[PDB]
């Protein structure tokens, strides 16, 4: 995995985000220059997991869950960024929004649902002219665009702001 992270910064990844169940990766990928880390699940080992890593030195702390009351409960324990994963998140991230939230966060494999998004908004994709809709979304006028799960190498070149690697 250092391996790997190694090449990508190595091209022209300025921004690299991490995710794992292991905390020891995410306590470990800190050291390896990690930009951005992200927590998944339990909330009360989540918020856990939070707090040290505040206290570990993590510039950006970023939380995912489904459920927007446990979203805000990780802004107060030292979340950075709130992934919210449906036709209220409009009105969800509307009220993280509106309590202190700066950096928000949309995550899904069609660009018909993050560019709906766009109405401090992150673009996150999932992926499986594969790594192609961030020329899309750029050309929208986005200004976070998050690439996650061999396109990562593509999708820098396409113009990924943010790469997101996973376990093993």
Known sequence: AWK???????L????????????????EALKK???ILIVDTDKDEAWKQVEILRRLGAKQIAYRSDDWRDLQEALKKGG???????????????????????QIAYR???????????????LI??????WKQVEILR???AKQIAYRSRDLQEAL???GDILIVDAT
């Not at 790997?4 to 190595?10: A, G, N, P, S, T």
């Not at 994709?125 to 594969?130: C, G, L, N, Y």
């Open 4 to 10: 790997q992270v190694e090449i990508l910064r190595r």
């Open 12 to 27: 022209g990844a300025k921004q690299i985000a991490y995710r794992s169940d292991d905390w020891r990766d995410l306590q």
């Open 33 to 35: 220059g990690g930009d």
């Open 80 to 102: 950075d960024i709130l992934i919210v994963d449906k036709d209220e998140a409009w009105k969800q991230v509307e009220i993280l929004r509106r309590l202190g939230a700066k």
């Open 108 to 122: 899904s494999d069609d660009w018909r649902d993050l560019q709906e998004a766009l109405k401090g908004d992150i």
């Open 125 to 130: 994709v999932d992926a499986t002219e594969a």
């Open 139 to 141: 050309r929208l006028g």
């Open 157 to 159: 070149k396409k113009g």
